[PDB]
Amino acid sequence: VGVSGSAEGFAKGVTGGGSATPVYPDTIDELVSYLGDDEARVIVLTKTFDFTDSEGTTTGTGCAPWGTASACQVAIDQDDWCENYEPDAPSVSVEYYNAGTLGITVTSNKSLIGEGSSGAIKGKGLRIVSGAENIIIQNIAVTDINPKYVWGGDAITLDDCDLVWIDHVTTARIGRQHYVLGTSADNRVSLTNNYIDGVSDYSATCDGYHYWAIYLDGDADLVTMKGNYIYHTSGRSPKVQDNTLLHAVNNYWYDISGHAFEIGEGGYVLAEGNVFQNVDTVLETYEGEAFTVPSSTAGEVCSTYLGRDCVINGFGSSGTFSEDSTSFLSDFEGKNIASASAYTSVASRVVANAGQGNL
């Protein structure tokens, strides 16, 4: 088996391991060596690669800023987080697996794919290290990484890498972030057809909604979000900061008891053809700029920059997000722009195609 389809949007042209002969790791040590070696590879996962106990367990002390009920999340005191960034109240005993703490290193030219609904990584995430480029991660699940502890683990981390395509990936029951982007100026990333499963037994809101979803904290990066299914989260869906240009097209947000967008100072968002269903608050913080195509006529302004009109979003039992800032539209010129379907087909097509196993 190999990579199915190709990247749309900013990372169009990504090849990953290309035509390299597929290798089928057998043990977790082999998987780790294949992702970090200096050679083009197509790596296939046919079973769940469990890393939960691989690096032991630590007993330490953290705080409980979001209640002390069973269904609440508590924080691990990394860098004296508690006492520093939030002079906490109850300090509790925490016991976590050391593997979830840091993700597996991923170097350049890799295609990591899963076969059917079999490929998965448990107890540890992935980290696309600085300088790495041309990486395809498709059809796998990254789950169970210290569910009850913040700082307990991040599922997928990108830090200063270019031409990365994450497609049909499912993430669930992670301690902290499902996606954290620390990309640099002009780094192209396409996140397509992914399934962010925010349903967890422990949440920083204690209701079973994951707060730490998607964090775009890059420098001057270009991110395309298309066909993603964001479900049962309570915040950071997504949190955009610095000077990130985000093209969010044809995504589906459903059952968000909390909020979706947090647009920090400097962040640019072009949101078109998305569906927001049962999202309490679509826009929380707004210090940056956004064009949400308030009407089809307003969308006509996109023609000179994207080669076509922008399309409206659909809102069903959700808060509003109606902004028409167009200052940043010329930043689209000469780049690979993902196409947009009417929002009318989005809810159905996303639930049918998003996530591991629906390739």
From Swiss-Prot:
It is an enzyme of class 4 (lyase). It comes from Aspergillus niger. The lineage of its organism: Eukaryota, Fungi, Dikarya, Ascomycota, Pezizomycotina. Glycans are attached at residues 68, 109, 348. This is Pectin lyase A. Belongs to the polysaccharide lyase 1 family. Keywords: Carbohydrate metabolism, Cell wall biogenesis/degradation, Disulfide bond, Glycoprotein, Lyase, Polysaccharide degradation, Secreted, Signal. Its EC number is 4.2.2.10. The active site is at residue 236. Pectinolytic enzymes consist of four classes of enzymes: pectin lyase, polygalacturonase, pectin methylesterase and rhamnogalacturonase. Among pectinolytic enzymes, pectin lyase is the most important in depolymerization of pectin, since it cleaves internal glycosidic bonds of highly methylated pectins.
